[PDB]
Design a protein around this ligand. Sequence first.
Ligand SMILES: [Ca+2]
Ligand SMILES: [Ca+2]
Ligand SMILES: [Ca+2]
Ligand SMILES: [Ca+2]
Ligand SMILES: [Ca+2]
Ligand SMILES: [Ca+2]
Ligand SMILES: [Ca+2]
Ligand SMILES: [Ca+2]
Lengths: 213, 213
Amino acid sequence: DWVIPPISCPENEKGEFPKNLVQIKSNRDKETKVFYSITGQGADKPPVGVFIIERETGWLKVTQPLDREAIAKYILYSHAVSSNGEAVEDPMEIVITVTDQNDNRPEFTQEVFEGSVAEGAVPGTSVMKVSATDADDDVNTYNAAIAYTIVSQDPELPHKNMFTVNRDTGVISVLTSGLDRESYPTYTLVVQAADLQGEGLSTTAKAVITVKD
Amino acid sequence: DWVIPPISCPENEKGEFPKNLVQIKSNRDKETKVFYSITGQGADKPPVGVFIIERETGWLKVTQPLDREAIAKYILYSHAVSSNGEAVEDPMEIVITVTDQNDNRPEFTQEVFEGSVAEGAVPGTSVMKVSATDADDDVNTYNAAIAYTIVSQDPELPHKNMFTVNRDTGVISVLTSGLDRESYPTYTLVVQAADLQGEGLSTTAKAVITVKD
Ligand SMILES: [Ca+2]
Ligand SMILES: [Ca+2]
Ligand SMILES: [Ca+2]
Ligand SMILES: [Ca+2]
Ligand SMILES: [Ca+2]
Ligand SMILES: [Ca+2]
Ligand SMILES: [Ca+2]
Ligand SMILES: [Ca+2]
C-alpha cells in the first residue's frame, strides 16, 4: 500500500494554532463522499487532541507546541468512512517525529562532587571526575554535547589555577605544583557544563578537593 | 487506496534546482528494498524530465521553472519495484497543479480599432468598443482582471476629453459636446488595458474615431 513517510515536526512551535502537517486522501473520493478521522496516542488516546484532522479536506493538524523530551515520536492511524457509514480504506499508519530544539540546560548528576589528592602528587595526576547529562537530542544535534570548564577556585592560593578539567570527560587533574595540606587543605572549584560543545546553555556545580598527606 | 492530493507548485520558480515537492513511500519497505520511479507527461513523456524522483528515498522533484500558460496541470504515475524486479504496488496517480504568477501583460485583440460617431450625438452616446485578453489565471486571481483607460487624445480640441471609456467593458462613449466634422473629423485615442483591476501590467492600442454628418 502507498503510505506517507514519517512527518517531522519541530518542538516548541510558536504562533497560531492549529498548524497544517500533511493532507491525506482516499481515491474513492469520486465514488462517494468520504470523511476522515484519526486514532491513537496523540489523537483520541493520551495525550488526547494534540493532533486533529479536518474531516472533509483531510488536513492533519497539530493543536499545541510539542515537547520532544516528553514524547519524541507519535504513531497515529487515519480512517476513511463514506457518508453511508462504511470504511472505504484500511487504516493507514502515520508517524510523527518531533525534532529537537536546544531547550534543556546540562544538569550535573549531583550538586557537590568530593575528591582528594596527595600533597606530593605530580602535575597531571587525576584527582576526581565531575559529570553532567543533557535531556536534548544527542544523536542528531550538538544540543547535548557537553564541555566542562572550571569557573573559579577557592582559595586562589598559592596560584589561582592549581587544578584543570578535561572538557570532554570531566576528569579534574592537578595542573601545577604547590599543593600543601597544612596551608590550604580544602579547595572549592566551581565547575561548569555547557552544551553546543561549550557554546550553548550552561549550569554550575561544585568540586571540593581535600589535600592529603 | 490511500493517495496524495493534488500538489500545488508555483510557476517561474527561482533559485536552485531541483526542488522537493513531496515524498512517496511503499509500506513494503520492511519486506524488501524498494525502488521508486515516475511515468507520464512531465516525466518520461513530453515534456521529458521536468519532474524527477529519487529512486531510493522517494522524493518527487521539479527540475526547472514551470510555465502555467504552457502547461497548467500534470498527471504523473509513481511506481514501486523491489530489488528482485517485481512491482510491489499498483501505480499511483500524482497530480501537479501549476499556480499563477502575474507574468502576462494584457493584449488587445488588435492594434488599431476603428469607430465613427454622428456630429450631433448626445453626450453619453456609445461609439465603439476596444477589447483585450489576458493569458493569466482569470479563475483564481485578479491577474487577468482588465481595466480600460484612455491615455491620450489627438487632437486635444475643442477639449482634451471628448470621449470616455468604460473601464470594465471597453466601450468608448461621447463624454462632452462639441464634436465637429469640418473642424476635426478624426480623433486618435491611445487606450490602455491594465490587469490587477488597473494596477498591474499594461499595454496600449489605438482607437480612431471618425466624425460623421
Ligand atoms: Ca523540550
Ligand atoms: Ca530539546
Ligand atoms: Ca541542551
Ligand atoms: Ca606540607
Ligand atoms: Ca507564465
Ligand atoms: Ca501567469
Ligand atoms: Ca496579467
Ligand atoms: Ca459641423
